[PDB]
Design a protein around this ligand. Sequence first.
Ligand SMILES: Cc1cn([C@H]2C[C@H](O)[C@@H](COP(=O)(O)OP(=O)(O)OP(=O)(O)O)O2)c(=O)[nH]c1=O
Ligand SMILES: [Ca+2]
Ligand SMILES: [Ca+2]
Ligand code: NA
Length: 329
Amino acid sequence: WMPAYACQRPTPLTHHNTGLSEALEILAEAAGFEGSEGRLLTFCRAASVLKALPSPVTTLSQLQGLPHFGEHSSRVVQELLEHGVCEEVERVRRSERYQTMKLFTQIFGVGVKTADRWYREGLRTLDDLREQPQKLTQQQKAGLQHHQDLSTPVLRSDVDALQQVVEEAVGQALPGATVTLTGGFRRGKLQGHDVDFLITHPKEGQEAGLLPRVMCRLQDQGLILYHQHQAFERSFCIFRLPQPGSWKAVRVDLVVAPVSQFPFALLGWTGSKLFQRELRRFSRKEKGLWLNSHGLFDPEQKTFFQAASEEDIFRHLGLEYLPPEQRNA
DNA sequence: CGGCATACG
DNA sequence: CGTA
DNA sequence: GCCG
Ligand SMILES: Cc1cn([C@H]2C[C@H](O)[C@@H](COP(=O)(O)OP(=O)(O)OP(=O)(O)O)O2)c(=O)[nH]c1=O
Ligand SMILES: [Ca+2]
Ligand SMILES: [Ca+2]
Ligand code: NA
């Protein structure tokens, strides 16, 4: 009925169990703030199972036989179904630890480990961080200065203008190179935390050295508020996006892949994050193959699969094809 | 109980 | 350590 | 936290 890996089932962007999945994802996020990747994964997988169901869960017995629902996740759903709230979830939501770890980890340049250290040092607010700026990396200073803009969602309707400026820079850097929108927007999201572009060229090898040339040109056009190099193949930058009478900062990721690897990079960067983790787990644990954003490796034959398309990759792995809009695990 | 995705900057 |  |  319900397979155990998220890559084995369609997961649409919008579904019939939103409130239940959001509660489980709070517990997932809190598990992550405490360093328990295992508990985070189970809560995320349980949430994702609900996203794949064809109708709302209305009674506890509808969880019977679903994967990733044991005593804990089932108790969470039960309380939500009976009372409209789950005490554990609310306790997490209002905890000082959760709220502060959430605030700090949302800063670009701050991960769970840094946030945790700052929390143990007694820091609680962004103004706390701004008072001692000498303790911040350059990346964190930019994340902190731009935090307000970066906390507002990027709209799908912003994306086309941004893709056009990136295409112009890419075209000058390397005529014939292409720009593909990936990430959540390619899965159909109408808003997202950042924009993801995948760049390649139809002649294998021509893309080598491309990304510094692209970044230089965008920086010369005045469009880059931050990037790490202001050789590489991924750039995590903050872009100047036009707005009425002004502009806002937005996060934009650029990645370059050779065309031979483009299907693997397209698959990886289109996500969702849980979908890719589950796909790589399935590949390795069920098929004996090692998957990443560069390729698919058979460690017995010591050979890489060639792929001309995402469809090829699903077929290699023995999985029914899922379009990007059904990869919202 | 072991395992939990897999990279690059 | 950060990032995807 | 859950699966196998
Ligand atoms: C963060 C992250 C992303 N990815 C891949 C899959 C993600 O869909 C893709 C883009 O990363 P994100 O931009 O972080 O996620 P997103 O585009 O799906 O969500 P949003 O709309 O909020 O911006 O990169 C991983 O494979 N592993 C990770 O840890
Ligand atoms: Ca994104
Ligand atoms: Ca991104
Ligand atoms: Na962060």
